[PDB]
């Protein structure tokens, strides 16, 4: 009868193996961001699933939690990238979102994890700028805008973007990298796909001793 | 006199390469708690380079002054050399997938995969060790019993082909790696990586061309004219210096130049 | 003196 | 007015402090100088359980101290036969980020929960032959940090929403909610008789709760950081805690104050789990450093170490008969020690 | 939970017949299935086995080679292909589920069975008496003895008790010595010395009337004791 | 308002905690030591069992 229990345990092992294959090849993305951020667009945790080019992504929209993160954030050292979404057009909260990004980035545990930073709601940002660095910032020509964009919109949105990259670069030397983007947007799956490929490539470069 | 500079150079190379490989393996043995299966390629490499500096070199040193003895020795030598070559080539291919298909490398590389490919590496080293292995026995000196100019000549040329072939393979794969890292360049990583890969191909060439050239020449000589004898003397001493220098430098280039290692 | 190849 | 209420609060606090200090005549160490030390304890890994795909977060022993359940963030509950190391059951959970699991003392149910804020009870002994969810306990507003069965119909939970709750599983409602905490609650321990339990919270305070009256009988505040682990002494009169500040501390429910502290200057890492051995002489502790330590609960001499883990020791548990210790770890393996 | 055996009927000797049993209301794939036989007015007799996931199959040497046991997990069906049926093979064939893990109850559930009519050094289970007439309210202690110690080195005794009521399939009473099955009242009890065992019906009721069969599971070309039938 | 209600609740619970009875740590520690000695032999981790009674090996 013990032999029958062992055959049961080995059937279970076969099933666990069939799981482990799907566990490795899927990428896990932690989706953070304030309430203002329209992160929905792309009880607690919502474990959304999607795929790109036969690479399957597991995106965990953690939520319905006490405003503190110190504890439950330790769970996500296994993720490839945190996706931090911020509604750029809420100028007043934006400093709070900035401190939130600081608290994530310099988190003791996330130190290894890159951040895919979506500066969301570019459309409202532009329409507001048409209708926050009011004095002394102008776009560095190293980055150039898409056609049709009012240089006011460009200088403002690159000011905001710089503000996040500034925190990203003042600490976390090269262990992890923030990947800022502007979005509203069907391509957001593709941006994540590309930045995840890049994160994995850099992880290999570190790992293979290249 | 004749052998003192040779003694000094070979003994320095011996001790330096021994320290290098010892350090490399020693920090890898943290795999019990701190090193991931990708490091087993590095460990196999450091082993093959160590055995090149433990086998071969000390006997070449003390041969400044039996049959079954030289059958295990010669097999060990050939297998250790070709295991080093196949370590380098397999490292080159894994680094190709690591960079050109970054996701599949992450998923596929597992201890159950790494041990399998390392087994393949050492198995092929064995299977390519034999044809030259059994030709050698006592004669006073470990020397060919079988004909030197017909069977050995083709064996040496074939192992030379097995050096030219991975040379080209790793040149092409590092070329593609460089092209991809260029595309993603178009900050330091992408460039220093390509420089190190070029250096790796250059040093593999510098270190395995003398090794094969030496014994291929020895095989092709129909008769040993005195000037030909002296020329071969030069060839052998220089080739020894270069080849053992390569097996000494492998630990540095492959492990200890890595930022992942520097944090002792 | 007389050398012997690497095998 | 708020000022007057807060002043009354402070004077009450000082009254409590003074009473506790007046009771604090001797010290546990001051008595145990004469106790014969435990000396070294060495325990060897007797088993290793290698099923889990990812970091193991919790384990619990069945009352028949041979079966064992553990949870890992890959979304799996596994029931292990601790003798043969067979996997009795593998349970796919609906939420991947489970942070705690528990074993019914009757052995019929296991509970698990986590970032989904739901404590799911699973029926192990269905007639259909599979393991099905019996009920889902949804009422919490925060991640579930710990749950412990009182019996097949009553389970206590701890949550990041700062409340511990008692549930009636037949219905699925909360019977009584325990609120007095201020930070996220982290661990539970039911008294041996299950009339009282103690909970640790991120406010570095430990509380003693009446399961029936529903009210906080005492609060303890010795630690300097979030309490990750709490465990009752086998006689039910004292409990240990484990804190991110690297110290374990023993409190006495009849002395109403801290009794002993367990720390070593070399230990900088936070404690993840604590548990007493059957007689209560040994206090084990899990750490972010990958080693678990054994403390003489009376002498505070670090009697030993359980060294055989290569990542965060996330969970720990002694069998009901004391014949073994299990430890789970973020390396995804459970080692059984003895 | 419901097992419905199908096929059989009447066969010309030397022919072939295939039983089909359709399971329902339980996780068919995770249960190990047995086929059990009972010749008319005879005792129970093991026929076959096929573990979960078809990895293991056993046969009684009486049918070894002649019978093939197969299952269809996706269709929750159990089969038994019979190749050259002899007169001996006439019997009701019962499908039985069994699941083996620490603390499981094998053989707990038996199908309604289907009838087939045809025109050494193993364990032997001995039951003392064919019959025992006793009045309601009395206690009874049916007894069994085995040619081998069923106490295993792991510390548990692989003796099973089944009760076949008149016109019904057997139902498990005690799956290991003293392990009272599920759904049976605490009146039934069991114990033994590792070679002799006794089913104590602590307080008899009129519902108990029927034949009690012991069965071993220590090492299995599985085999049953002969029936003991209570009377009143 | 709730804030003053919260403070009132805090002071009431602090009173509830204060009135509880307490014994000197000397006696409590003595009782804990007495229990720790009373069950010392049954502790298989404190006093390792022989391999005959160890169910794991």
Author numbering:
A (entry chain A): 8 to 49, 182 to 270, 280 to 332, 335 to 360
B (entry chain R): 58 to 122, 130 to 203, 217 to 263, 289 to 366
C (entry chain C): 3 to 9
D (entry chain B): 8 to 345
E (entry chain E): 1 to 119, 135 to 247
F (entry chain G): 6 to 62
How do the authors describe this structure?
Human neuromedin U (NMU) is a 25-amino-acid endogenous peptide that was first discovered in extracts of the porcine spinal cord with a potent smooth muscle contractile activity. The structures of the NMU-NMUR1-Gq-scFv16 and NMS-NMUR1-Gq-scFv16 complexes were determined by single-particle cryo-EM to the resolutions of 3.2 Å and 2.9 Å, respectively. The NMUR1-Gq chimera complex was stabilized by the NanoBiT strategy. Pairwise structures of NMURs in complex with NMU offer a template for understanding the selective recognition basis of these NMU analogs. For NMUR2, R4U lies in a more potent polar environment (E1052.64, N109ECL1, T203ECL2, and T205ECL2) than NMUR1 (E1202.64). Moreover, the side chain of R4U in NMUR1 is less stretched due to the steric hindrance caused by ambient residues. In contrast to NMUR2, a more extensive hydrophobic network surrounding F3U in NMUR1 (L591.31, F3347.31, H3387.35, and V3397.36) probably makes a greater contribution to stabilizing peptide-NMUR1 interaction, thus raising a hypothesis that this hydrophobic network may discriminate peptide derivatives with different receptor selectivity. Conversely, a wider space surrounding L2 in the NMUR1 pocket may serve as a determinant for designing NMUR1-selective agonists. Our molecular docking analysis reveals that a biphenyl, naphthyl, or indolyl substitution of L2U side-chain sits closer to H3317.28 and may create extra interactions with NMUR1 relative to NMUR2. It should be noted that although the connectivity of our structural observation and the previous functional evidence on peptide selectivity, we cannot completely exclude the possible impact of the NanoBiT, which is introduced in the structure determination of NMUR1 complexes.
